[PDB]
Amino acid sequence: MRIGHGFDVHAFGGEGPIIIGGVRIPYEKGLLAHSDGDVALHALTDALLGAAALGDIGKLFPDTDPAFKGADSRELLREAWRRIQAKGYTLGNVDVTIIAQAPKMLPHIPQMRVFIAEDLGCHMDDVNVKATTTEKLGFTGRGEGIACEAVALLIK
Amino acid sequence: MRIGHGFDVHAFGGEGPIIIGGVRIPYEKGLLAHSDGDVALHALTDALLGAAALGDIGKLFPDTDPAFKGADSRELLREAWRRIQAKGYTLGNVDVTIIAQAPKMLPHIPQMRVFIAEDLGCHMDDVNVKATTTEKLGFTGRGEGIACEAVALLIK
Amino acid sequence: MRIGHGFDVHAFGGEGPIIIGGVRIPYEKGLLAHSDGDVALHALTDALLGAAALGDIGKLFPDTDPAFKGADSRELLREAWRRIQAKGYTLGNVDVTIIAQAPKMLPHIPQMRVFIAEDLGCHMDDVNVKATTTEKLGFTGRGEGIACEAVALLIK
Numbered sequence A, B, C: 001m002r003i004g005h006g007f008d009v010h011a012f013g014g015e016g017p018i019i020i021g022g023v024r025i026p027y028e029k030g031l032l033a034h035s036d037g038d039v040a041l042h043a044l045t046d047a048l049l050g051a052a053a054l055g056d057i058g059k060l061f062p063d064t065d066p067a068f069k070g071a072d073s074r075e076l077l078r079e080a081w082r083r084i085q086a087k088g089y090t091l092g093n094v095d096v097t098i099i100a101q102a103p104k105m106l107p108h109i110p111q112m113r114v115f116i117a118e119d120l121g122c123h124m125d126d127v128n129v130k131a132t133t134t135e136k137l138g139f140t141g142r143g144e145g146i147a148c149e150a151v152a153l154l155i156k
């Protein structure tokens, strides 16, 4: 009954591990962002919110508002989901597409699913995650950063 | 019952203000395009049309056809919507994602919604709009241009 | 009842014609990829699979697994679709957006539709295809490669 679309990108820099779909992945560099740069969750939240017609992470997570300043993506997703259910919506299914030249996400997909299908209730079958390489082409191909696109569905 | 997806990008150049979602926004440069470069509406039209399985703005708005030569995006959207209803379709909901490093769209989102929810009938709640920065990464990050992605849904 | 999203890109190089949507298109260069670089079908398969929650072409088409090593995109799509129906899903509609500076896809859209609406059963009306230029902007604008995005829907 309601469709949503999210999109988000983040740039590299900072040694430490990166976090995607709530999973800590080892890698040369880390992701910037003044919040743990979880492009996957951020794009997922935006999809969900955009389908409920509630904004785009700037309603709960602005940037200069003491409401939700320092918090990880898992908390925001969880908060965003609460407001969405407040408007009487329930999850149908969500599909997430991660775009990066490296590192390899294939081995982490399942753990990501577990996290996501946990912070939204629902069973894993209602959550899909996949990654794509881009073939060393754009800013993602040159390893300058990482991007993610997501879609979602709601009800009754 | 029917899903659609649109995508569109435009390059900068030309002083004058830019137009996005039908709103006149102030900015250093303007958008090229041989039609007011309204990436937002163009991507929205394509979504709607692509869900109705009627093409991609080249059915009503080609480029070398005296049918709809000089016209703004609002007219084309409005025309495209008419043909869509002709095939007996009605709007479910649409979500638009604008991608740009600047200017800030946040303050114009609501006015955009008003315009869109006007040229498609329906109430604002069936139209969502959000913007994202890209973090100074791709051609959008370098300020070379602006892009937009959109999804939609129809019926009965 | 189930939404899906796909995305895929490929780089140029290799004289010979390119293949998109199963159609052989004439052009200066060809597409790399260690499989016929059919970005259109690959993105379409991923959408369908991602909506059925079955992966992302690495379940049927890995890279180092003698299962489905050398095969064109039409075979994989056809195989992927079979497994999808195995889980009791049926096609609702799909929309594909091809992104490239050249060559012109406009004249091939219909033949692509015929191929797609053949390997998925269903009538053409359940399959949409469109192309966009990008305005000589990103890696697609510089002619370095070609990309494709797709969405889909399933049932009962």
Ligand SMILES: [Mn+2]
Pocket (backbone or CB within 6 Å): A008, A009, A010, A033, A037, A038, A039, A042
């Ligand atoms: Mn982010």
Ligand SMILES: [Mn+2]
Pocket (backbone or CB within 6 Å): B008, B009, B010, B033, B037, B038, B039, B042
């Ligand atoms: Mn345009």
Ligand SMILES: [Mn+2]
Pocket (backbone or CB within 6 Å): C008, C009, C010, C033, C037, C038, C039, C042
């Ligand atoms: Mn591919």
